[model samples]
Target: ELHDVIVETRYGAVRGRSDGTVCVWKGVPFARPPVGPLRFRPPEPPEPWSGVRDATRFGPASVQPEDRLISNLTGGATLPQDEDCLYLNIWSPSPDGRRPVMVWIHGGAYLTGAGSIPWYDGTALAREGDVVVVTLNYRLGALGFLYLEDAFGPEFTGSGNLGILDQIAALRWVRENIAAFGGDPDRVTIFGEAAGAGSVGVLLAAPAARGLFHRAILQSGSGALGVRTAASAARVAARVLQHAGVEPGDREALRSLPARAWANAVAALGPGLPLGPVVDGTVLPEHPMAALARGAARDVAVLVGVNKDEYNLFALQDPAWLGDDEAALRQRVEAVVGPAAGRLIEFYRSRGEGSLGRRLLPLMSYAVFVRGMLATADAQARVGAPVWAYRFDFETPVLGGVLGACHALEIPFVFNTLDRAGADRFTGTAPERYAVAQAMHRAWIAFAREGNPQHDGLPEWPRYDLEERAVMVFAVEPRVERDPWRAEREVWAAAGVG
Candidate 1:
């Protein structure tokens, strides 16, 4: 039942493959190659092709280090990294121009991950929900996030922020061409997890991305108000340039360097190097959550939430946590949370049933993930933006049940791809969990179609507000709860942490 299909974009015509039910176009170019002179500059539109170009295989992923941990967490490494990597994929039930569109931005700490991963396969979501699904590849690592404009001047205009600009360019492409793929450009929803979710927060406040997307879903991300100021970016940029062996004034040298060399230089800068959005007055202008509080993206409806055990995944990297006693736990909490450590520890411990993993998970989760979700949701709700919040309590039986409802675990359920790579390792073979996936998937689709997530399968999910803090908890049996993290929220407020 597979056949060839052709569609005309602004640039030219492209030939894609269709499998009986869903039509798919992979590796469609959205921006010109950001190599040579385009390196460190903003993305440019791709050149028009002479005839119908093949759009079958996935494009190369953005340059990133070959780290095994990243590969394991992200499913697998995207083969053949390249600088000319601004491409996107599309899936539709039919090219009828009526279904809603959901555009996904993949996350890997803003360093790795590609939309081409099997876990992000959009066929099932598109077919089941009657929506058009699009996944995209954006720049990453030094090539994408190292801010060099202050050091390199105008030639490197959007430098440290090219990755964000790549995402915006992809959204622009969707607005212009999604209708041809059976998608309503006006009904676009942007969703992502982790760093991808961070990108969604940025887009919500980005002046350039306004009116491009009508809705947003931020999973395990939000609260990023000031990730990088230009002052901080300048320090990182200096280290990057020093490592790359390119002088700050040598624009020609930086542009002409091989992609491998740039990636290698970034790798040398150590794992702790932070590469992400910078508050460049021209590009990002201000922190995303700060702008959200001031009515930015107020018209954009949002659904944001975090996993119950957002920090449990880090245990895989550090085994010492398993051996911590109460004294050790209290010491660790105080060391990280400062003077209010005892108060924060008691707040989470009382609610978590005294399990050490539960006791520690919320501390780090709130510091990094949960607090931001609450803050951003609260900000949006205050501005009269329709916002829905939820918590994924579906604990995994993996790693002897220690993983809990950790970070990235809800991804399989949301995408309805529990059989994809790494799913068995993270989610286990719990048949009952399928019901959870079905409910969550339906709610997501319903939100995309009707602008509300209150589907029949779920409880009467209510919009989030400062008063009740209503949240739908996704578990083996889904339920609605009010202010599930009230104690931790207050503790962080007292500690000045989140």
Candidate 2:
């Protein structure tokens, strides 16, 4: 089924490979390479080319750490890292027909992921769903987010939000050029998981991203408050410069240093979310939750949700966290959430949890991931926006089933890619997983195809509203329930966590 075809883009012509089922164009440049003088700058429009560019191979990933554990989990072991990494890939049934577009942003805490990850392969998604699929890479870690505005001054004003700007640049490319590759420019749905999903949330609030994407799907993330502040971001930049042996105002020296030097310092430095987005007065005027409450993205439809036990992936990675010790648990909890510690511990005890470690898993999951999502859902629902909510509860039968619907387990299922690379290990080899995958994949396609996700594959999926707090739970059986995480949410809400 291997065949050759060429498609023309606004910037140039790209030759792609087709096998009857899916026609793929890889390593297409959406923006200019951010190297040399462009380091730590926003992405620029791609340069024009006359000849057909061979888009058969994926581009390099953004500069990051060496041999990261998360990189292996996402199956991106082969993709190399470099400074020139602002590229995207496309998959379509044919380059001759127009279809709905699903543009994906990859996730790695804004630190370590690329769109070229194998588990993100869009062949099945494009063929079965009959939609044009797009995946992309933006900058990651300190190279993409080191705030130098305080040191370098005005020209680098929005430097901390370069990753967000990079994504907007991609969407701008999609708006102008996707139709040539058999995609509908009018119907672009942006989606992602974890930080990629977090990017989706941020885009909803971004003024520059308006009118570029019509719909959004946020998996396992809520567009919460960005952990990066101007004050903290500048401090991180100072540490990066100091570690790299560069002076505060020595712009040339800082730019001359290798990206790995900045990456190493950033990886070795932070205890919180790594060099992530900042609320610059221009790029992101307010927090995403604040924007949601004010009905900012009312014109755009939203489908947002998270996994049931999102913290299990981190908790189970360390045996020290699996113990039954109460003192250790309380101390850890208090350290992260000072004032809310007593109430949180009391709530866990009254709920009949097995051990302190077991209790901490769900608590941390809600604290980190679920809380912001619930608040965002409620805010949008209160404003009467077209928003749908979901909870991925399909447990993996891995490690004695300890990873109960853990983080990132829903990714392959969303694309019906349970058979893809590393998916079996992450999602388990259960026969029932296919059924869940089918339900979830169909729902994603339905949402991308139309504004609503109501279809024969699922029950009457309703918008998340104030009255019912309706949520579509994707598990053994896809069921629509009312506030399934109500107990935990109430405690967090009472504690002013979200």
Candidate 3:
């Protein structure tokens, strides 16, 4: 399987190959790496070159902090990681007419994760759906979202959203060159899991990314970190600079520090160094949910949802949560519910049938925050735009069956590549799971192509209405249901969950 194709980018020509299904073009830089003096500024367009560039591999990831926490939790420390990274890979079905393009974003809670995950492989989707699939790498952790609006002055006004800017750059690149690979420059969808989903929700609200995407999919992440404001981001930025011993007023000193030293300085901030999107007038003006509510994303369609036991992943990591006493459980609930603690307890106590809800309150708290994953769909629904929401209810058979339908479980289903590494927890290579994976992937492909996740052999996916709050539930005999957890959602509605 050899495909020889050349795309004429603004900078130069990139020669790529085809691996049986979609033509693959790899490691094409859309903008110059933001290193040294350009480290904090928006990306500078790539310089034009007269030569044909061989793009055979992935570019480096943004300069990210060494996060032992993620490595331990996800068992994913081996993918290539680096600072000089700002590139995207494209997989197009052919060299013909326009095909809807979907860009996949990887997750790491805004800290780690990569687009190179096997579960994101585009071969099946492109070949089966006749669409183009793109995945890209961006800055993460402190390097990506460390707010420094005041420290770097207005020159780096949107410095905190470097990761976001990276995505925008990729979209711009797609608009300019995806046509050469049989993709429609106008029709593009951004989708992701975990933090990637959260990123999609943020992009929907971002003014800078207004026209970059046509639709979005939020798998299991919502707008939690987006609640942090620009002022808060700046306050943390000042502290980060002070901790790094680099004055915000001194540009030379800031640039002179090694990336490793800078990352260490950020990590030393402990939990204080705010690590996600910050409102930087240009890229994003306010929190994502607020922007969505204000009709910022009226143009885009959305498919967003959470897994049933979404928090089981993090909750099962420790046994303290399994304690029997309801007193200890109440304290755990307070940590998650905060001011809504009383209501949450009352809600659980009302469902007195079994210890299920009580045994699950800690998990429910996680579901509450992460449940904002439904916001994108809800926002689109309010504006009469195409939107569909879902709640994955398939429990995994691995990790002692403790890992229920957790955070990344739906990923394999969407990709139809659950047989790949890291999917053993959910499907375990069973034929039935593979069948479900096929159905899930088909819907995603259909949605990416036509804004609807319906196809042959898949259940009827109804459009989400305000009253029904109906969503597609993926499990054995996936079906449409209204307000999957109406009681829980009402309890959480007080915090403005959407």
Candidate 4:
């Protein structure tokens, strides 16, 4: 049922064990840790090793501030935290020939998430099909996104988007070594959710990420909003350097400070710190959706979708935020976003058009759901690459009438691991859910194996276009429909995007 194997890597040889049908290799470094002198520099290949290193545990995450979003959402970030944290995990079969590979990026808004979360388990996917599943840990929070390009001249070259660079490094490693692990390097699919999907959306326009993967699947989130702009990122960088009491030209002076000090300085950017990828000129010349429109990424085929009640899950996470007063809600909008709050309130109210809750959800959904992803779909349409758009409408009555159909409900479903012990409470241990999981998981695999996602017994999910606007509506029956939410989408598009 299981076996252990040690394969040589660019850095060193590591031994990974197999459990039943899945071969798991954990804590393989794709790049040298960007600690000490390497801080702020692009990731580098790891030092080679002679002996077979034991790949049993996941490496620690990059140093993160005191934010529990990633840890709490992913059932707690179990890995340790440190500066030296750039590693990836793999689950495949034998290391003889090439197999379809799926590289999954975890989502936590660039602040949180681990390479070892439960929802991202690729064991089932690898065993059920001839695929290699790869998950990775990258720099998060201040360590990754503190773009002080104006201040720290040499070391701050990729200051604002170090986390993205970390991802690129991991993909580069897979490109070089996955063939030995029975994975087809050339036929890789890059997939992710929420923030991870946002990264993939950016990658579509990123020069650094080009040619890394052939196919993509963005579940429950897309490049719905332009990631933080290069100019905005420069402002953040200025704040970082000012807080550190460092000169704009002093790279060595900035690096000389302790890592903890740097992290603390970056952390003070507040709870809503703009830590996502920045539109730096080098790595990403333009925003992902914008780049897609200009035919920047025409080669890769993609599948994009979002859960119906993505943010409703977050609101119901603790049940304390329910029961709203209109005045209080309006105040919340204003306080959280200032003068733009009024317009946002109007946008939500007008879009909801009687379904105030439904219409207004895109306000929170822009970064994670509607905006960037629609742009990606539109961009794909511009290039004529195969693109499919979907909406996961699987409603759950278990939340006492409220929907937990929020951000990550589809994870368990897609993995077919709803009953994997601790995860049963997510879907109430429903027997019928497995059929849905079986269908969705296979659809994902098919998309990865080929450009199209088709399987026997499923409905014909058509490619999306601006006119036909066909979309797969995933619910109890999962039907194929054309532009179910046109007015709302139109209002959103007309807003010109903030």
Candidate 5:
């Protein structure tokens, strides 16, 4: 049964719904819609509402590419998409404002994704952990990340990272209004997976984002080193402007460009697009990992990790590697890891893993996911920040189990939403999977509530440091190990990869 549950925010009163377990407020506006004249500008405070505004539906996802393959693979797109999409949702089990609050940023390669994805449903995690959960949407693709300062002048100086500013706006809103949603403003934790995790990396180093949240949890992300240089970002901006046939001084012309046209221009510009945070001197003066090395966010506790087979998920989309020829695999590895291909192959072969896909997947995984995360953890640890690392080894039975513990495999398990409609496709219907979710979900909750992620169920998850690269491996039965990926990590370190 649904009963009206109303809460007063700094802006206005919002009426939500409760179904015995948790009360939810969906589609709550956090900022003024970034449309019309507001397009490509920093987020502004949302206009106040008269009386109580209905908060039952989710706001649309930001303008992005419509890829059906991604839609199907990550579960069909559930929310509507639009340019006016700066909104957030909340799930709370208490109205006393005493519970720990968790804010989640959804990841889609900084392209396509919304907070309304079924897998991100916070009710289960909220109810189980007795904490408040929040998810939100920000600008994406060209609208969110295009660097335009050099071309468009000071008015659009921070254009490259407007999406990041939107997130900061949402965090400010949470700081001011989350108390009314039964959340403690001071005890907030920001967490995400993949690009969302990457966002957390940026947030940790972001001067504007400091002190807004107390802790962070990064999963299958932390590779976000920020855009390398302003010059490179400017190059991407030039392509967009050239493709759109708009001049830098013409603010009206740039503002009038349709979202689809901007996306098309970016698409035509190929893979070298401005799709992530740029090292705008103001918002992000230095790279996130570099900043961490300098103790930028040393006060913020961190829990970070990656999946065992993070690259296997991406390999499924391509059939070129299906032939399983050793020479072709060697060439592919050489292309990415440089001349270390032979040593890398020998290392994998020595482990007795015979399948071509299985052998190839780890190399790509380390190249993209593993090495970067290890570097991030090392940086955080070096700065005296309390950091814990883990490796998600829960293998998915999809594609006849060839996918292994690929990227995003830990999502459903983290939310403990394996029972949801399409969850079976990502997480097999094994009775043991629920137990993994129970452990993983509880650990996240514990981290949010108490700075440490320890619980009665999980083993002693030690802090990650140079002496003991302790990592908690989440699998059928969770255990702690000292430097589980030491060999691969050492190889990458010697090659100056991470």
Candidate 6:
């Protein structure tokens, strides 16, 4: 059933591989290679090719540190890391019919991950939904997010924000050329997990990204509330210079140093969130959450959700949290983020969540992930952007289920790639997981096709609004619940998180 297939793009024809059911095109360039003099600059449209080009292979990933956790989470991309990484891949069940398009953006700490990762294979989604699927690669870490206005002048205005620009450029390419790949250009749905969801949040409020994507699915990210302003970015730039052993005034050294030097600088940042999108006034004018509240993305429909055990993925492996050092945590919070955060921790503790050490799991989940997403949902619903909300509570059956549906745990079920690479080990042998996958995959497909996820298998999922605050709970048995954790939402709100 394997054969060669060719689809004509505006730039030229590309040859790809096809099974009997679905066709795929890989390593297709969407922008000119960002190499040499073009480093740290905005992405330009890729030049047209002369004839049919091979598209059977995946392109290189943007520069990022290689870690075992990232490798397992992403299923790993084996291609060499390089600076000229600006490519997209495509999957279409029928390259002749007009169907909804789902464009995926991968998640990391804004420092790692690539679209070429194996867990993201779109073949099954395209086959099952009868739609087109796309996954793209964008620059990451310092190469894609360095703010250089002070060092390189106005020409480098958007240097801190190039990663987002690269995303917009790929979306623009999908709009102009996806029709040839069996996709309805107007029905594109942008979906992502974590930092990728963060990127989706940015695109929704970004002026240049307007009209490029009509719908967005944000999984476990609170929009762009965390994006660094140019002023904040200057602090990180100083750290980058400090790590690279270069001075701010040394413009030539900064420019001429290899791209790996920048990646290594990001690596040297150690813990905590690293370099990311900057509010550079041009590409991203303001915080996306504020823009949604002010009615900027009024026309864009949204589906936003978060995992139940988000923090466990990050901290469960570290036994430091297992120690009954709750007092240490409270003192740290008090000294750093102030007593308000410490008070919130006390509130979460009063609920009787077993040992104090175990409490750190949901403690961070609420502070970092849950509250921000709810705030974003509240803002969007306030301004009339059609929105739906959900919570992924499917726990991994491995390690006594300590992961408890932790961060990025829902990806395998959503992609139906539980058998891919290390997914089976992570998802465990539970037959119930397949049902969760089917329910979520169908809902995502329905959302892409009709701007609504009201599929037959799910309960009457209602729109997320100020009235009900309803959420679709995806578990072994999916159900709709109104304000699943009302007290915690209120607790964070009272503590001034929103």
TM match of model 3 to true structure: 0.91
**For model 1, how does the per-residue alpha-carbon lDDT over 111-167 read when each residue is reduced to its tens digit?**
878888788999889988999999998898888988887887876666767888999
lDDT of 2 by residue, 226-277 (tens): 4466887888788877878888778789778988787787777754475777
Instruction: Give per-residue CA lDDT, model 3, range 432-490, as digits (tens).
Output: 77767777888888888888999886777888877788888888778899876666666
The lDDT per prediction is 0.83, 0.83, 0.73, 0.73, 0.82, 0.82
Better of 2 and 3 by TM-score: 2
Q: Which residues of candidate 3, in runs, are more than 4 Å off? A: 66-77, 224-226, 269-273, 316-319, 324-335, 349-371, 494-498
| Local error of candidate 6 at residue 65 (angstroms) | 0.6
* TM-score of every candidate relative to the true structure: 0.94, 0.96, 0.91, 0.89, 0.94, 0.96
What is the C-alpha lDDT profile of model 6 across 256-298, one tens digit per residue? 8878888898789876677877888888888777777788778
**Candidate 1, residue 378: CA error in Å?**
0.4
How far in Å is the alpha carbon of 237 misplaced in model 2? 2.1
Estimate the lDDT of model 4.
Answer: 0.73
Backbone clashes for every candidate come to 2, 0, 2, 12, 0, 0
